[PDB]
Design a protein around this nucleic acid. Structure first.
Ligand code: MG
Length: 480
RNA sequence: UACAAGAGCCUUUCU
RNA sequence: GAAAGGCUCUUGUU
């Protein structure tokens, strides 16, 4: 048996605006639209965006902290006949003006602006870049759609040279929209070490009165009928009081293994980074776990919790912070619709962002809820299920649901509220980037096609070093 | 591969 | 049933 059991429901939710809904169980349920957190920005004005219907924009808004870009480069892998230097100059001008309007001043044209062909030319030229322009902060790599050049660029920048690289498709260079450039600039500001925005500090739940770390974990697996290809487990952790900046750890682990075998070491490194950054050990630990089925609830809860506790024991003598273990499930057949036409959203007629249901469709004796935190524009919105497998922090339903909503609003690649909290999304992004690293490790030997070359040519140590990113990359948000 | 979100086709073994 | 992975497609945004 297992010595750990999930805590029951501490109470029912009361905060938010009451909204009748229908669910395919039709079962008439009652949700609560949580009010969106105010998004605090920077600049001279320090604008406070109010997410309207799940969405806010970057018009008249500057970054909370903007990173000036004095040195950057452009490597165009698109065909020169298809992406002319006129197009590149127009893209540079439009991107510079949008970035300056967003509080991210780019001082002048890139020093390097050259054309290259093939993935095999990525690693030399990139190395040449690191050997030519000191203080280089970014390379804009233009790509003609799908190519191995993308994964080779990602591998070289992340796990080889420690270089921040942003890729743009060719079709977004010839025709440029202000929204595309603004989202690009969001990614640039995140990748270079700046914070785009924070939640309004006076509107946060009381859990931020004490030091706290937010952990997001996700394991991706290759298709079945395999065993040469391993699973990839990624755990990210928030590195400051404003839950925006995240550090990442990644591990190659056994084929189709769901529990994170090396979770204790990853959590230990993340806690060490948190103590280095905030100079305070986390009093509370919030763990958002993605990609765990119902039938494997307890095993993960038996292992990973212990691992986290082990990391705490390995952090300092007599250090047992309260641990909150929640599992995120975007995949389920639970659909929610508004009962009256006056509350439907857009053309698609979805439910509003913030719709939280913790009654009548959840587990009667367990702490779980549904939260639709994203604005649906097509079809039927799919809310995210959050089941609290462990709660040493004595959370209430209101505080945990509001914290989940604000974490969903902390996603930084867009000015939108998304379906899952930012740590889970970042764990997914790190897992995908690690899979790109693993794929482009085998780019000179794409398929191998050998007996001994495939029997013991991809041993676990080599892939473990393959997913490990550079030292200059480890502390940054390369995955965004 | 600017981003989010939702329906589809193809490996995929539990069958 | 699920790991979600590719291929796309659709609505788009400031
Ligand atoms: Mg994933």
């Amino acid at each position: 048996g297992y010595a750990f059991k999930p805590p029951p429901r501490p109470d029912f939710g009361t905060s938010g605006r009451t909204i009748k809904l229908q669910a395919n169980f039709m079962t008439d349920v009652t949700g609560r639209v949580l009010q969106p957190p105010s998004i605090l920005y920077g600049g001279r004005n320090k604008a406070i965006a109010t997410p309207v219907q799940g969405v806010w924009d970057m018009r008249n808004k500057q970054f909370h902290t903007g990173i000036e870009i004095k040195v950057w480069a452009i490597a165009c892998f698109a065909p020169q006949r298809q992406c002319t230097e006129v197009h590149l100059k127009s893209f540079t001008e439009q991107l510079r003006k949008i970035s300056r309007d967003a509080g991210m001043p780019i001082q002048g044209q890139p020093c390097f602006c050259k054309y290259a062909q093939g993935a095999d030319s990525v690693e030399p030229m990139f190395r040449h870049l690191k050997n030519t322009y000191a203080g280089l902060q970014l390379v804009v790599v233009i790509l003609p759609g799908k190519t191995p050049v993308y994964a080779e660029v990602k591998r070289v920048g992340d796990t080889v040279l420690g270089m921040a690289t942003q890729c743009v498709q060719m079709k977004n260079v010839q025709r440029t929209t202000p929204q595309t450039l603004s989202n690009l600039c969001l990614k640039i500001n995140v990748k270079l070490g700046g914070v785009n925005n924070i939640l309004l500090p006076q509107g946060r739940p009381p859990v931020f009165q004490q030091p706290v770390i937010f952990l997001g974990a996700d394991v991706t697996h290759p298709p079945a009928g395999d065993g040469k290809k391993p699973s990839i487990a990624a755990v990210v952790g928030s590195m400051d009081a404003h839950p925006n900046r995240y550090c990442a750890t990644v591990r190659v682990q056994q084929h189709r293994q769901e529990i994170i075998q090396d979770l204790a070491a990853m959590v230990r490194e993340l806690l060490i980074q948190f103590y280095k950054s905030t100079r305070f050990k986390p009093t509370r630990i919030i763990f958002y776990r993605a990609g765990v089925s119902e039938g494997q609830f307890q095993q993960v809860l038996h292992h990973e919790l212990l691992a986290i506790r082990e990391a705490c024991i390995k952090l300092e003598k007599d250090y047992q912070p309260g641990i909150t273990f929640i599992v995120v499930q975007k995949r389920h057949h639970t659909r929610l619709f508004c009962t009256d036409k006056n509350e439907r959203v857009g053309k698609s007629g979805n439910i509003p962002a913030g719709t939280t249901v913790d009654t009548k469709i959840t587990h009667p004796t367990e702490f779980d809820f549904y939260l639709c935190s994203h604005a649906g524009i097509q079809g039927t919105s799919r809310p995210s299920h959050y089941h609290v497998l462990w709660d040493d922090n004595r959370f209430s339903s209101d505080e945990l649901q509001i914290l989940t909503y604000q974490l969903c609003h902390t996603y930084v690649r867009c000015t939108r509220s998304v379906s899952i909290p930012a740590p889970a999304y970042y764990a997914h992004l790190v897992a995908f980037r690690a899979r790109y690293h693993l794929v482009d490790k085998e780019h000179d030997s794409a398929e191998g096609s050998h007996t001994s070359g495939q029997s013991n040519g991809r041993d676990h140590q080599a892939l473990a070093k393959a997913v490990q990113v550079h030292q200059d990359t480890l502390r940054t948000m390369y995955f965004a």
